[PDB]
Scaffold this active site. Structure first.
Site, mmCIF file in Angstrom:
data_model
loop_
_atom_site.group_PDB
_atom_site.id
_atom_site.type_symbol
_atom_site.label_atom_id
_atom_site.label_comp_id
_atom_site.label_asym_id
_atom_site.label_seq_id
_atom_site.Cartn_x
_atom_site.Cartn_y
_atom_site.Cartn_z
ATOM 1 N N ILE A 1 0.873 -1.184 0.000
ATOM 2 C CA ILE A 1 0.000 0.000 0.000
ATOM 3 C C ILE A 1 0.899 1.221 0.000
ATOM 4 C CG2 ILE A 1 -1.734 1.346 1.242
ATOM 5 C CD1 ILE A 1 -2.731 -1.292 2.453
ATOM 6 N N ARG B 1 -1.192 11.496 5.435
ATOM 7 C CA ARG B 1 -1.774 11.995 6.698
ATOM 8 C C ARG B 1 -3.263 12.323 6.539
ATOM 9 N NH1 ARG B 1 0.417 16.519 8.505
ATOM 10 N NH2 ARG B 1 1.413 17.127 6.555
ATOM 11 N N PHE C 1 -5.705 7.591 3.935
ATOM 12 C CA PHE C 1 -5.953 6.920 2.682
ATOM 13 C C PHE C 1 -5.339 5.494 2.609
ATOM 14 C CE2 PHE C 1 -6.759 11.156 0.438
ATOM 15 C CZ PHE C 1 -8.091 10.855 0.250
ATOM 16 N N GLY C 2 -4.284 5.272 3.368
ATOM 17 C CA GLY C 2 -3.707 3.922 3.465
ATOM 18 C C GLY C 2 -4.741 2.974 4.041
ATOM 19 N N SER C 3 -5.371 3.379 5.134
ATOM 20 C CA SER C 3 -6.483 2.670 5.741
ATOM 21 C C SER C 3 -7.612 2.444 4.792
ATOM 22 C CB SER C 3 -6.954 3.429 7.019
ATOM 23 O OG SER C 3 -8.064 2.797 7.577
ATOM 24 N N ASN D 1 6.529 -2.076 14.689
ATOM 25 C CA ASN D 1 5.520 -1.054 14.246
ATOM 26 C C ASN D 1 4.323 -1.143 15.188
ATOM 27 O OD1 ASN D 1 4.003 0.819 12.948
ATOM 28 N ND2 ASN D 1 4.237 -0.063 10.898
ATOM 29 N N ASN E 1 2.308 1.049 16.545
ATOM 30 C CA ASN E 1 1.093 1.789 16.183
ATOM 31 C C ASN E 1 0.263 1.026 15.136
ATOM 32 O OD1 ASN E 1 3.672 3.188 15.153
ATOM 33 N ND2 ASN E 1 2.173 3.510 13.477
ATOM 34 N N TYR F 1 -4.197 -2.590 13.476
ATOM 35 C CA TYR F 1 -4.673 -3.881 12.911
ATOM 36 C C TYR F 1 -5.510 -4.653 13.948
ATOM 37 C CZ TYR F 1 -1.238 -2.905 9.217
ATOM 38 O OH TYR F 1 -0.529 -2.323 8.186
#
Lengths: 204, 204
Positions: free
Chosen positions: A129, A137, A140-142, A168, A170, A175
């Site tokens: 992704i 920020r 949009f990745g989500s 990672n 965060n 997830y």
């Protein structure tokens, strides 16, 4: 408002996919790994129908609304995803699939079908992704990950999987909040390069 | 001698694939996870050509030689793999693709194409390898993995990947001996079940 849409990539999108992959490499300081070509992408990514092998969703953005549908989508099992969000783009001209239209490519998700033997059911595996500047920020990745999950549900696929860096924290929390599980026991193994090529010598 | 051959599975092989998956579940004490059906396998595993999506290599064995070729293979990029090796089989009748011929299915490898964005090149991911009794402790799992590696080389694919349990020290050493690398930083994440289905409710 900024309008967004997630659609299926087709072969004409190869220049945008190429440039997004390159920007991802730049972002990660991994450009020394980049050998991708438009010809390479074009000859490898589109040998099957969407969802049957390698599939790319493209995120596009516009200051004006998108059409409600895409009538030329390369799968009958896909309708686009949309969101309205409440910005200078110097690379816009490199990311416009119709030069005259006010729409630019902002990101992608590259995935492919995996399989659960025990269920006799396909799933999806998400390989990459990436969201380019100036659209970071903004969640949009989500959105891209959510699109893959939603597509799996619509198609009756059994699982969506991906990898995360152990440190990672965060992303791991995010997830888990989504109801995903981190499988602590497994490690990925990779055979590549000269080590892979040496198998040419094995006499079977 | 015991002769062995590794070939491509085709739809008529579904009963053998089903039974091998079941034996794998039994072996692992994971039968509570098994919901695979012949109809499920038949409708999911063969929607694309070999190497374009889900692909299964079958290991067969015989006390007499195999033919040198297969002229009906479902890919032009595949010729079978062979080895000669220097045993009661009560399940033989459930594993004979031609009831009159002295050949039985002994194992399988289920894999599918993965992708390196940075290389614009496909690889293979190995999902499952299983060798049934009475053909265990003969190196056939290795043979199946080797077949996938060799196929990747012949096709110019860039990587073969799989997962291993972190505590499987013997397998990790074996993979390292083959020139594979264990990627210590990555963890697999999985979204499935009700958590996956909940994405149907997400308004995009």
């Amino acid at each position: 408002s900024m309008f967004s849409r997630i659609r299926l990539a087709t072969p004409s999108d190869v220049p945008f996919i190429h440039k997004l992959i390159h920007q991802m490499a730049v972002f990660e300081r991994l450009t020394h790994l980049f050998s991708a070509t438009e010809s390479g992408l074009a000859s490898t990514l589109f040998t099957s129908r969407p969802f049957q092998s390698f599939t790319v969703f493209l995120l596009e953005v516009s200051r004006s609304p998108f059409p409600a549908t895409i009538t030329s989508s390369p799968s009958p099992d896909f309708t686009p995803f949309f969101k309205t969000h409440n910005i200078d783009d110097p690379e816009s001209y490199n990311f416009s699939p119709d030069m005259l239209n006010d729409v630019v490519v902002a990101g992608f998700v590259l995935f492919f079908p995996n399989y659960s033997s025990f269920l006799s059911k396909p799933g999806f595996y998400i390989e990459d992704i990436f969201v380019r500047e100036p659209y970071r920020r903004k969640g949009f990745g989500s959105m891209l990950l959510t699109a893959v999950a939603k597509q799996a549900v619509k198609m009756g696929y059994g699982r969506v999987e991906w990898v995360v860096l152990d440190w990672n924290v965060n992303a791991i929390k995010f997830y888990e909040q989504m109801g995903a599980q981190i499988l602590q026991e497994w490690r990925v193994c990779r055979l590549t390069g000269d080590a892979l090529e040496a198998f040419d010598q094995v006499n079977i």
